[PDB]
Amino acid sequence: MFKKVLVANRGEIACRVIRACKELGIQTVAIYNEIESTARHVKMADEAYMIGVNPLDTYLNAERIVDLALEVGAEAIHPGYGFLAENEHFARLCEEKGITFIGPHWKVIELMGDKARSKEVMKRAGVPTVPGSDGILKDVEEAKRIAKEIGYPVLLKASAGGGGRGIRISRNEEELVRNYENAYNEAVKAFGRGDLLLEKYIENPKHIEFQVLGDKYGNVIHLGERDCSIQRRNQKLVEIAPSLLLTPEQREYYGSLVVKAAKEIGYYSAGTMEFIADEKGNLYFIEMNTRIQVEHPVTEMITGVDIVKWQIRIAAGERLRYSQEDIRFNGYSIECRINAEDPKKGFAPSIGTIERYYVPGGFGIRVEHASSKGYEITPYYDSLIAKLIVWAPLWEVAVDRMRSALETYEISGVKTTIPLLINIMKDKDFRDGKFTTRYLEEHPHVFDYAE
């Protein structure tokens, strides 16, 4: 086990990692910017250093961070999420200097950082990807047969031009033929090549992601899935585990496939495969996050596995003790992101300082946060104040516990998402389990709350 770990992050994730380290008996090193001389993660760590020439350079200068790790005797670095966590050069640099990066191998970070390569990698492992043409369509005849085979509606886009000319949606073969001719000609006019690409169109989809965890000996398990469909500006707001969509058969089916693909790429540490999902539970891979995710706690509540602590154990060379049949999914868990932002003004960040601050607690309630009275929301960093997490044996009780926790969470000095999240918990469709990635668009009544 490591004697000392440097946490190359801030805020709630820095505190989550520090707590795991403290429980393991590991000495911690925090880094911060001088604008945050008072941060919670700075007070929780055993030692803390201000580095960086501006608030973001503090966490994004890989060379400075690795030299500090060397200077203070840190044997490993946890990158948290965001910043450098999926930066292959940071991880390679750690390894090149003899510091363990707590995460997958830098070669894997690099491979799965490119969206297309990662889809190809997954296609070859057996994980479903969104069907479409294999590259450029030969001609409209091939377009008609591929579309018929994958099912309408389908999407057409030019291969050239980075989307300077847009997408066309076709609901039948007549529309496909017309759209093909028109997209071809627009692309000739705009980019001098008519070549087009086609893919199945997943309308009104859900966001479902699978969690994996592997040690350095090839033992890889999954920990089920999370439904993160309720989001704004591709920004997740509410996350649940397990999904209400999948059956246990479907969960183990898709789960063992992501386990196979991870085993084939030599994945270890924690990672997530994000999918889009239809009404019937068909899933299509879209991307892999090669790091811990913000919403990892809902998976921890239903499986009882401490993911962050396992990351550290795995990076130090321990075996993942469990096997896939030791993993059980017990109850339902919901996470709500309490952000300092104003949902009635475009989720603009509410910059300022926390005045009243009461954190709820109780049976089945978990809080991840780095906030107190006087915590300052700056424009330089993300607007997350806290993650409110709930567990219950039944879906409806989880909803009620979450509603009740939110209704007692007092934060003043800044606008937050809490009133919105309360309205979601009270909404019949959400309670019914009926929501997609367009939920917010489709339920504007949840923005109706009083000053």
Could you tell me which residues come within 8 angstroms of residue 327 by beta carbon, excluding any fewer than 6 positions away?
Answer: 221, 222, 223, 224, 303, 305
**Under the criterion CB under 8 A, does residue 373 sit at the interface with a second copy?**
yes
**Under the criterion CB under 8 A, does residue 361 sit at the interface with a second copy?**
yes
CA 277-279-281 angle, 5° bins:
55
| Two tokens, residue 16 | 């989550």
**Under the criterion CB under 8 A, does residue 4 sit at the interface with a second copy?**
no
Window contacting a second copy (CB under 8 A); options: 2-10, 59-67, 174-182, 302-310: 302-310
Residues 377-396 close enough to bind a second copy by CB under 8 A: 393
Q: In angstroms, give the least distance from the CB of 391 to a second copy.
A: 10
> Which CB atom, from 22 or from 443, has the smaller least distance to a second copy?
22
Name the 3-class secondary structure at 154.
Answer: strand
One-letter amino acid identity for 160?
A
> Which CB atom, from 16 or from 105, has the smaller least distance to a second copy?
16
Tell me if residue 291 is catalytic.
Answer: yes
Annotation: binding site for ATP: 115, 199
- Euclidean distance between CA atoms 12 and 387, whole angstroms: 8
One-letter amino acid identity for 198?
L
Torsion of CA 279, 281, 286, 287, to 10 degrees: 130
**Under the criterion CB under 8 A, does residue 228 sit at the interface with a second copy?**
no
Catalytic residue among 165, 291, 337, 401: 291
Window contacting a second copy (CB under 8 A); options: 36-44, 96-104, 230-238, 257-265: 36-44
Q: In angstroms, give the least distance from the CB of 224 to a second copy.
A: 17
CA Rg, the chain, in Å?
23
> Which CB atom, from 64 or from 366, has the smaller least distance to a second copy?
366
For residues 385 and 338, is the Cβ–Cβ distance under 8 A? yes
196 sits in which H/E element: strand 196-200
- Euclidean distance between CA atoms 386 and 235, whole angstroms: 15
For residues 44 and 115, is the Cβ–Cβ distance under 8 A? no
β-pairing verdict for 341-342 and 332-339:
unpaired
Among 98, 166, 304, 317, binds a second copy (CB under 8 A): 304
Among 95, 110, 274, 306, binds a second copy (CB under 8 A): 306
Site residues, a second copy (CB under 8 A): 15-16, 19-20, 22-25, 40, 43-44, 297, 300, 304, 306, 308-309, 356-369, 372-373, 393, 397, 400-401, 403-405, 407-408, 410
Which residues form the catalytic set?
A: 291
